[PDB]
């Protein structure tokens, strides 16, 4: 196995495959004019392909990922990196820098189980990035309810939807993708979501998604990501979407956020409860804590409905406003004992639901 490649042509692929003992190594393969790099943690895998325009010899090995990446990154901008397999070591040479790395046999590199694709679609990268970024923050982290430690991907009509919840607050994002889809639902593990998100480079390469019974694969440009799905049932989240909020309030996103952020300083550190008093074109926010410190914020908003009061977790609401990053927000309300739904006033694509608190 031999190849010589420019540093930068190696670094982006290296970043991608480092994501997921031999699991600490990258599989390197030279075949039919291409260097492929693979990383895996047994749950998911990333493969990156690099065209080889310089002379090369086929073969495969595995090397320590961190060390190989660090060596490549540490070399000067635009350096040519020459790699050859010599016995049980992989030799890396560039200028008068030389390295000998330990290898493990390519034959030992684990493969993900084989599977059949049953649902497929192609969409712009930007659309998938919007879908994930809109909801990722609301996934559970390491809940014993393992089916929450990930993100629902739901197809219906011509729409792809992501849903995330930690068992307390909810994020939903829905986008038309211009193809007729079967009504289908899968849960992608949270680490897979993160790795998928970070494979999307913000460019013009379209993303191809293939979903099997127990696996998902995403292909964009020179990168192929594959993951197991979470084998579980996602909660019936539709039950907490307010059926008909009769009251709708519109406010400047940043003004509302800064008022909540200031009030939060004097909210209970653990339960983070703040109260909203809604009246004709006015919102008053209050907070207090066990040391009897108190905050009050009054802002002008657009609101005509009946006066009402409602409490909620200000951390959850701040998370929502930070995700929305827009000009104006719409808060849809019912009463003091019902949830609140929050959206960008200019777009219904993303929606967030926060539960009510009594004080």
Ligand X SMILES: C[C@@H](C(=O)O)c1ccc(C2CCCCC2)c2ccccc12
- 32, 77, 113, 236: which one contacts ligand X (CB under 6 A)? 236
**Window 176-195: contact mask with Cl ion (x via CB under 5 A):** --------------------
Q: Does 232 bind ligand X (CB under 6 A)?
A: no
Q: Does 294 bind Cl ion (CB under 5 A)?
A: yes
Q: Does 174 bind Ca ion (CB under 5 A)?
A: yes
Q: Does 137 bind ligand X (CB under 6 A)?
A: no
Q: Does 165 bind ligand X (CB under 6 A)?
A: yes
For the bound state, the minimum distance from the C-beta of residue 132 to ligand X, rounded and expressed in Å, comes to 18
For the bound state, the minimum distance from the C-beta of residue 237 to Ca ion, rounded and expressed in Å, comes to 8
Residues with Cβ within 8 Å of 349's Cβ and at least 6 positions away in sequence, in order, are: 130, 134, 173, 174, 175
Residue 25: CA count within 13 A, CB half-sphere: 20
Alpha carbons 253 and 265: distance in angstroms, whole number: 19
| SS3 call for 338 | coil
- 170, 220, 283, 329: which one contacts ligand X (CB under 6 A)? 170
User: What DSSP element (H or E) covers 353?
Assistant: strand 347-354
Q: Does 254 bind Cl ion (CB under 5 A)?
A: no
For the bound state, the minimum distance from the C-beta of residue 140 to ligand X, rounded and expressed in Å, comes to 9
Q: Using an 8 Å Cβ cutoff, are 304 and 312 in contact?
A: no
Which of the choices a copy of itself, Cl ion, Ca ion, none does residue 12 contact, using the CB cut-off of 5 to 8 A by kind? none
* CA proximity to 187, closest of 160, 216, 218: 216
Residues with Cβ within 8 Å of 187's Cβ and at least 6 positions away in sequence, in order, are: 147, 150, 151, 152, 153, 229, 230, 232, 234
Q: Which residue is nearest to Cl ion (CB)?
A: 259
Residues paired with 6 in a beta bridge: 80
Q: Annotated binding residues for DNA, as ranges? A: 66, 142, 146-147
Window contacting ligand X (CB under 6 A); options: 119-127, 161-169, 323-331, 343-351 = 161-169
């Amino acid at each position: 196995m031999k190849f010589t490649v420019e540093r930068e042509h190696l670094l982006k692929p290296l970043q991608q495959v480092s994501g997921p003992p031999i699991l600490g190594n990258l599989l390197l393969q030279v075949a039919d004019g291409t260097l492929s790099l693979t990383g895996t943690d047994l749950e998911m895998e990333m493969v990156a392909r690099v065209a080889l325009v310089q002379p090369h010899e086929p073969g495969a090995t595995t090397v320590p990922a961190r060390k190989f990446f660090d060596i490549c990154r540490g070399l000067p901008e635009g350096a040519e990196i020459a790699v050859q397999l010599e016995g049980e070591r992989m030799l890396v040479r560039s200028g008068r820098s030389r390295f000998s790395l330990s290898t493990l046999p390519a034959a030992d590199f684990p493969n993900l189980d084989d599977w059949q694709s049953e649902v497929e679609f192609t969409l712009p990268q930007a659309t998938m990035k919007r879908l994930i970024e809109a909801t990722q923050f609301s996934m559970a982290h390491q809940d014993v309810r393992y089916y929450l430690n990930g993100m629902l991907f739901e197809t219906e009509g011509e729409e792809l939807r992501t849903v995330a919840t930690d068992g307390h607050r909810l994020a939903v994002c829905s986008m038309p993708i211009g193809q007729s889809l079967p009504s289908h639902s899968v849960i992608v593990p949270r680490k897979g979501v993160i790795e998928l998100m970070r494979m999307l480079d913000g460019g013009d390469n379209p993303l191809r998604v293939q979903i099997g019974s127990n696996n998902i694969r995403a292909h964009v440009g020179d990168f192929i990501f594959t993951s197991k799905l979470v084998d579980g049932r996602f909660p019936d989240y539709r039950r907490v979407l307010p059926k008909n909020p009769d009251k709708h309030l519109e406010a400047g996103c940043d003004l509302l956020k800064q008022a909540f952020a200031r009030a939060a300083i004097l909210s209970n550190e653990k339960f983070r409860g703040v109260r909203l008093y809604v009246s004709e074109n006015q919102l008053k926010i209050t907070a207090n804590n066990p040391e009897q410190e108190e905050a009050e914020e009054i802002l002008d908003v657009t609101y005509s409905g009946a006066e009402m009061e409602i409490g909620f977790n200000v951390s959850y609401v701040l998370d929502v406003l930070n995700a929305l990053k827009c000009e104006n927000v719409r808060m849809m309300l019912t009463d003091s004992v019902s949830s609140v739904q929050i959206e960008d006033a200019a777009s219904q694509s993303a929606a967030y639901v926060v539960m009510p608190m009594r004080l």
